[PDB]
Amino acid sequence: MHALVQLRGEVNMHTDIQDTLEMLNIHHVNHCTLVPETDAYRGMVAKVNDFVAFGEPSQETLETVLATRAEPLEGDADVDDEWVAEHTDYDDISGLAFALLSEETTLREQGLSPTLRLHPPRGGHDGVKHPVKEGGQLGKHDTEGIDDLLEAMR
| 87 CB neighbour count, 10 Å cutoff | 15
Specify the stretch interacting with RNA by CB under 7 A; choose among 20-28, 53-61, 74-82, 94-102: 20-28
Specify the stretch interacting with RNA by CB under 7 A; choose among 67-75, 116-124, 134-142, 144-152: 134-142
Residue 94 or 105 having the CB closest to RNA = 105
Specify the stretch interacting with RNA by CB under 7 A; choose among 55-63, 74-82, 88-96, 125-133: 125-133
Q: Using alpha carbons, list the distances in angstroms from residue 99 to 68, 90, 92, 106, 138.
A: 18, 9, 11, 8, 27
Smallest gap, in angstroms, from Cβ of residue 107 to RNA? 9
